[PDB]
Structures are given as C-alpha cells and as structure tokens.
Design a protein around this ligand. Sequence first.
Ligand SMILES: *[C@@H](C(=O)O)[C@H](O)C(=O)N[C@@H](CC(C)C)C(=O)NCCCCNC(N)=[NH2+]
Length: 216
Amino acid sequence: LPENVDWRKKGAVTPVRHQGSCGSCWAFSAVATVEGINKIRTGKLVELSEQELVDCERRSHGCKGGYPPYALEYVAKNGIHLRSKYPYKAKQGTCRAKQVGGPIVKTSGVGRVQPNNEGNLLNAIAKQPVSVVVESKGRPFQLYKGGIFEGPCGTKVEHAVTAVGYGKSGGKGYILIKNSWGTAWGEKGYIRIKRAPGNSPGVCGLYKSSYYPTKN
Ligand SMILES: *[C@@H](C(=O)O)[C@H](O)C(=O)N[C@@H](CC(C)C)C(=O)NCCCCNC(N)=[NH2+]
C-alpha cells in the first residue's frame, strides 16, 4: 500500500458541487464514486446526474435523506445519465430517466467494506474513490476552514461524503474527503480528517459505513 493517495491528481475527480438545502448528500456521495471508477476503467472523466437518483431511486427519500448502497444498486442496474442531460435542481421531481437521453454509464455491482477498521478502508481507497459517512451536526465541522480536523464531534453520522485519498501530514495521518457544500467551505470544498488507527468507528464516525461501485 502507498503512503499517500489522491485521486484528484489522477484526473478522477470532478469539481466540487453544492447540494443546497435538499437532503441529497446520499446521491452526491454515490455519483462521485461512479465518476471516479468510470475514469479509472475508461480513461474518461464525465459528470453524472445526482438528480436522476433523487427522482428515481425510491427506497431512499429524495430531499429527505437516503442511502448510498441503494443509490449504488440503482446505477448497477439502470446505469446513470450525464449531469448536463439531467441537471440538479435541489428538489425532488418526477423520474425522467427514460425521457432524458445522452449516453449512460453503468457499473457491475457494489462492494461493502467491513466498517470500523482503518486498514479495510485504506485498501478500498487505494483502489478508487469510496462513499463514506460522518457526523456533520457539530459547529466545529460546519465552521471548518482548514487543517487536519479532529472534531469535537461524536459518531452519530448523518452526512454522506466521498473519500478521494489519504495520506500523512508531518506525523498525522488523514483521509481526504470531497464534501458537497461548495468551495467556500473547508479546503476549497475538501476536508482532511484525522485518521483513527486500527479498529475504531473513526473520528466523527468516519469508519462506520463505506460502499463502492464495481465496474468491468
Ligand atoms: C445528507 C445531507 O444531505 O446532508 C442526507 O440527510 C442523508 O441522506 N443522510 C443520511 C445519513 C448518512 C447516510 C449517514 C440519512 O439520514 N439517511 C436516511 C434517513 C434515516 C431516517 N431516520 C429515522 N429515524 N426516521
């Protein structure tokens, strides 16, 4: 395993986006992982539609919160359209997957990493971008402006994000995360969260529930 990994440098990460006031983080996390694996397999970075998921994947609740593994199952089964063909509007509407055209990106399944273990997570990230969860309700997290984040924060997760890398910053290990709150938050939309060693729920509950899409 490499000491440091950063999928941004390998052209596998699209620019940071803004979910607005719609509890759509679950769709944002899911889309970022599929954009990454599509780049890795085909050599092409294309932007995909969070809105298709919000409108069509209904085991989830649209703008009221959802579930990354379900979103990942929807993509493996139905594939997903381009962001330019089915743009994000921060509100749940009628599913138009079959009315919008343009090409579709499809995957072959979805993997579940065994939670609460640093190692399990690092090996998954070394491979590709991973959907991860975190407790974002605390003021420290909302007011984050930079550095290696340590909380204060509990482990009562409620916000899905995307791990696009990991590394070491002079002595402290961290995990590189792509948030969906725009570029004015954190480190140009990103946050480097401290790495809890070995068996642990992770700082702010980061090791609690991780998924990724597979692609032939
Ligand atoms: C995240 C966001 O937009 O910031 C969005 O609320 C979301 O999808 N949250 C998830 C939590 C992550 C997957 C950790 C969520 O809360 N999903 C399902 C809602 C659970 C409903 N709970 C009860 N008690 N009814």
